[PDB]
Amino acid sequence: WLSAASFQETTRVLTDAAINCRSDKLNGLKENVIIGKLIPAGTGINRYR
Amino acid sequence: QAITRAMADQARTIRIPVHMVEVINKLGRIQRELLQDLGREPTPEELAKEMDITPEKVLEIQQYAREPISLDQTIGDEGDSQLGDFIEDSEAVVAVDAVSFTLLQDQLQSVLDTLSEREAGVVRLRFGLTDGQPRTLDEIGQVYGVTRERIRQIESKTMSKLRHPSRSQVLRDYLD
Amino acid sequence: SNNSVPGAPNRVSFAKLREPLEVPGLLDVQTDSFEWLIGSPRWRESAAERGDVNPVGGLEEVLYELSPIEDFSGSMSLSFSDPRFDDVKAPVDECKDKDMTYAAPLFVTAEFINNNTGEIKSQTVFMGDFPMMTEKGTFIINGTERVVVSQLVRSPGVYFDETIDKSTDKTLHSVKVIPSRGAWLEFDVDKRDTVGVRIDRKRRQPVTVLLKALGWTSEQIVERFGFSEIMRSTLEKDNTVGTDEALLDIYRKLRPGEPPTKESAQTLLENLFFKEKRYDLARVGRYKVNKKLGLHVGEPITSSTLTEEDVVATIEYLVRLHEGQTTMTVPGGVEVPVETDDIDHFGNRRLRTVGELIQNQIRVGMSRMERVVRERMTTQDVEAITPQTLINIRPVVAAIKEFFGTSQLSQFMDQNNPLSGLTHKRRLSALGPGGLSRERAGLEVRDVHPSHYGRMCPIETPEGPNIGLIGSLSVYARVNPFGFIETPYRKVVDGVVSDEIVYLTADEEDRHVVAQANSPIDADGRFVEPRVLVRRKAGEVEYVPSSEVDYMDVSPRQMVSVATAMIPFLEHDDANRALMGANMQRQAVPLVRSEAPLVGTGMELRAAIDAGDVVVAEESGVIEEVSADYITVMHDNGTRRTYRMRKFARSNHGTCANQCPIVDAGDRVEAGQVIADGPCTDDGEMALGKNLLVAIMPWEGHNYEDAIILSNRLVEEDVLTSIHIEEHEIDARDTKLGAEEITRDIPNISDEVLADLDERGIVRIGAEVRDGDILVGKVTPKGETELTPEERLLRAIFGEKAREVRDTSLKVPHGESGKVIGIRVFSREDEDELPAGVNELVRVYVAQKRKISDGDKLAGRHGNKGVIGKILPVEDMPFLADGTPVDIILNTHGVPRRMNIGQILETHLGWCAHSGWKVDAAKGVPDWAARLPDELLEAQPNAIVSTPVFDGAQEAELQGLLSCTLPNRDGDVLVDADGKAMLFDGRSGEPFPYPVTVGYMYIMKLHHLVDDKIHARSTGPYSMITQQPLGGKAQFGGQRFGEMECWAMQAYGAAYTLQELLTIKSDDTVGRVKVYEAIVKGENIPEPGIPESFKVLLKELQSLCLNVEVLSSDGAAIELREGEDE
Amino acid sequence: KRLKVVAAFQQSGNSPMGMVLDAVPVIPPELRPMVQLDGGRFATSDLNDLYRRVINRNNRLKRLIDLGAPEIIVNNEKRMLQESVDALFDNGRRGRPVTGPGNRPLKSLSDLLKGKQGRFRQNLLGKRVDYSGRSVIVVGPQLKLHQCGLPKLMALELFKPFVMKRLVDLNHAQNIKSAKRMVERQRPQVWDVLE
Amino acid sequence: DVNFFDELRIGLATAEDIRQWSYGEVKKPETINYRTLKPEKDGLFCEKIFGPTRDWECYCGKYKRVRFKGIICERCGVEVTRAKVRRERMGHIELA
DNA sequence: TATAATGGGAGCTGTCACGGATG
DNA sequence: CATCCGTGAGTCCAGG
């Protein structure tokens, strides 16, 4: 929902997500940039990290 | 009566008491009475004498009458620029200034050393480094295991011992 | 000669003789408007000469619409008349200086009429201080010079549109009636052949429903609209019949929720469309509807309202246009052309000038005080009522103050150079209240319309997202009393051009046929060929017999604007670069001293004079005394008028408005002549730049991709050097800890840093300042918070007691530097009236003598821009055989691509004008120079000339003049008939293999100089909420690493870089501090923390009843440096 | 479509009661800050006038209820409270937006997240960075492909705490505080240091 | 304050949840004082609820030193922590 | 805070292209 | 397959 909310139609996204009680596993590019975690790509992946 | 009362009471984003509102409405009244009388807006000096005879307060009142502006309000030409994006957080911490403080801690640590354990004792006592509080000196010597206020005696045994890291000028830099 | 009218330098013009009419007073767009508002003498006379029957001023108009003001009883009656002004409360200069508003107080005569008592109390009321416009056509609001831009809006009236149906593919016709203010009303035709109407965007109903609501019989419907089957199909499909049932029907669809009385449905139908209170077509609104329908066409403008006759004649216009009819006579009205209207046509698009813009705002203020009036009438008793008791002008002063302060049309006067200001007064914006938005505007509003010809330039417009929404008014154009744009045309009787000139509006020119200006004319006045070039409605062109020519254009340069006409060989440059070339001249910076361009268009003269930033003599006379400070002129009648010179003054844009005297003492001078010119003005001509010796060649890559190479001569001779003044402010307020005091005693600062101050704490005049240095020493009392136990200890050792005053000094901003050229001190003590709370207020003015440097943006008049790449030593510069080093090395590559070979042609004519020339008259006058005017057959070195747009030099003559080029002092010709010349590489010494095109080109220094544009920041101030850095150079903020930029990081896979920028470099409160420590201690960079922005987000989600929790791998909600409690 | 909603309230023990509020959360102050400017005038965030609106009407409801006012009066108050809380949560959503001074629609809570300027796309997907700068560019035919010409002035502010480090290193400045003053005064030394 | 948390959950917030968050009910529409320019009590900026204006400085002034940490002054009920908490402390209004 | 007074007032105008709910 | 409301409509800089 984090990726979706910061994409478009944020009010739509949040209402739904809060109703479906959707948990978000912060495992994505958009998802990670927001919280300030190393992006799961490039030098971010555990393989190189 | 309920309107004008509740109006004066609720309308101001920053509340002013009833009388203060009564004043500003008298001030606006006497202004419009002098307005048609002098073919020009009347000087603060002119307004003062007629109603309250004090000029300093009229300057003050006219600022109380001033209505605030929204942070969220923008500049007409470009729809992106909002006022709040131009307000420097006077609160937040300067990087260098806070760091320089920390380097001042590294110099007083090189001061707790050349000083004795008795000497670095009263230092952190009345100035309150670890404490955060400056205890009254007639309590400091009694709370300390050494009496005859020998802790004030060790104080002067320190004041000149502090001249040496002061003659090293390593503390001289952090005052200017 | 071109303009042999003022006393101006002789600029010889290639031309066809242009004697129709001189360029009209350019500032008249601003001038004449405001004169109408106040009803000045010159206006009433101009109303007489134009033959305007019973002229009514803008202010007079407002009062008559208003008057009289009565209550529901009719018992009371308040009415206003005879508005008049005093003398201005303070002269212009003093206003700019003391940040007050240039105004002259307004008065009116008001009488309180009573019908019961019969008595009338009549007195004069104060209305407020009224903003007056300067001679320069500007306003002065709080010491800043401002300009009211003319708003392009949609004219009121009834408009017809043809829309094609997607499904049925049949022609459907729509109408829309647009009031100056009020309720909407549109009649549209279905694909079902049934006419419908939408009122204020309510749902569609049959149109017959409205007719039986008006009172018209169901038989009259059959009579008036029977000639069509689509109306017969409408009255047939008509739901209900009956006058009562119609009104009820309309009522029930208009306002649901309310009880339908037969008396409440009859009432609002009158009120929504036929009363002066809720509905109003303006003078234009009435006039434009009438013309479109052709009724009461001759009768004067008295009706301010829509009528039944208008409603009917509208539906009649709709049906006839639907079934193919082309013309129609309204019963009781003259014949009218029937077609679909173009909303963008300048006959339907209205230019509302300053006067009306100010007027409308006045009308807003009046209706507000009228409300208080009617409230102050029912309160006070009948006997004790005076107009002084009814009237509160506070909402009137508040509505005129607000307009100048807030509106998108009260603008900071674009003041780089005089032209820039001049064009600013003649902008035509479509933006603003009552106009349209930038996102609302499609592609039709912006592109060039046929009706713009001679009214609005097609070249001048911004490059940005504002393109086509802002334009400049054409040269010879003017505004008619109804807010449309007229244009001068020459009258042709029968094939014979007459000097009689008539101005035509847009739609009026459509009903005629115009010949292009350059069509050949007999010495008497007759055309040469029967068929000539002819302009016709809808921008269509065809050859037409001379019998049928009605009018002809005044000048070839009639379509262009003031700026566009200053672009030599304009017809040689594609609109794209030409556009920039006009936009950019207004960006030119005034140089230390200025040269008139070797090549010109003639416009350079009139533009500078009209600009108002030069000094013109009012009455003829002789210079009785001249100084750098002022000029005094002894008139013939004996009187003396002294003109004070503006000397080193800061413009709005920090450029240098400095005026110097032209005339020498004892010079005999006539009126209207330029006696002293200002910035970018040489001998009374627009000197936007310098004349530079150009060379068209790639030069060792330093001019690649439009960069520019300069001779160090331009730096050593200040040729491209300007002055730039900045203004710095600081005040001393009353605080809660005392008051700020400006003093030369600043905590913990040596007597070295303070060395350049005076005893007060202010810097001394003439001193030099760098960034960081102190301008005004101000200290404030700091809050008595417990000082550090670690600094307490540091104050016992050195025994120095701390001061309660923190340094709040005004230091010089980064980048700025120069000489302190003036101090302005205001005190509350010396009775200088300050805002409440302030004590001493200081301004410190610093001037910079900025020589041109790398990165400075240079441009020519042809959209050929570019920043300075390299400035070589004067010896490195490719030079001509006689040793002369060129000035500027342009890249050949970037010329043919831009279609702007005007820069080339100028370079040729530039050289011919530098060297001089002489046509060969032996064996007669050559066939190429046959058309060339006698005056140019022989030309001196450094001679000035004119190439008026759509006239001037032709490529033949230019080729010819290149052969005529006079030899230099050594008797050798320098360039050839090709226009090129041989160069010697000042670096290698060897000559360049191929001849290089050399010549002189006029170059301007645009206001995009690196000294302004450069910026960088380590740490600095931070956002109050998001805790990110602030933004902009003015705030010492950081750059933005946007959404797009992050993508660039991710694509690379530079995860650590990207993170670091979004974390410890941005809004990690604790991180940035510890990164600083790590750097200065020389350790390693720490692991970034949590973005404070993200924290804010979760609080913004929470506050919206969104229970957001961050869970660790187990499933428990963790804390975010915070806790939960109730 | 109906099940897509109802099934969601079923699954997780996520009560549908929450759609009706008995209490409305109040966002922290520093996130709706109120600031005095140098002009003495105060600049506040919109949310405070929206919050002020809900409280003033919610309290008026308490007085009306207590006073035993007729249903016609009380109900009206409740209706207003609804629009008060609604315009707070999402302004303009239902009906015409609440205007401040200048017929200006007030930013609501949800307005802080919406679209471009919102908290998501403007402040999280892209931020402003320290240690950065901007200037005009110029061709540099001399340079090698891996080089760029960084202005002497630009570098000094970019490497500002980096230069201060080596100033107190090589003893040009006695401490970190003086090192700063050396850079801001642009003393001749730093040009050697920064190199 | 470790950086690695596995999931971020969002749900519809209970009326009770609203109260568990809030360190107090705002009961007055008032913001600050017109003279003292201080956050008026039980208001929209009340220091009892959202925290102190200045670091470790209680409202009524009975406590002004760093020495008192986590102390709740009895004269005006203002916990002594940094104003840094005024960015994190929630409020709530109790609709009748 | 006791003469009697009893239902509001500005609208806002020149998009554009699309999906989803309704026809 | 065609209507009514709600949501989208490049980036960075600049200024008042």
Ligand SMILES: [Zn+2]
């Ligand atoms: Zn307390």
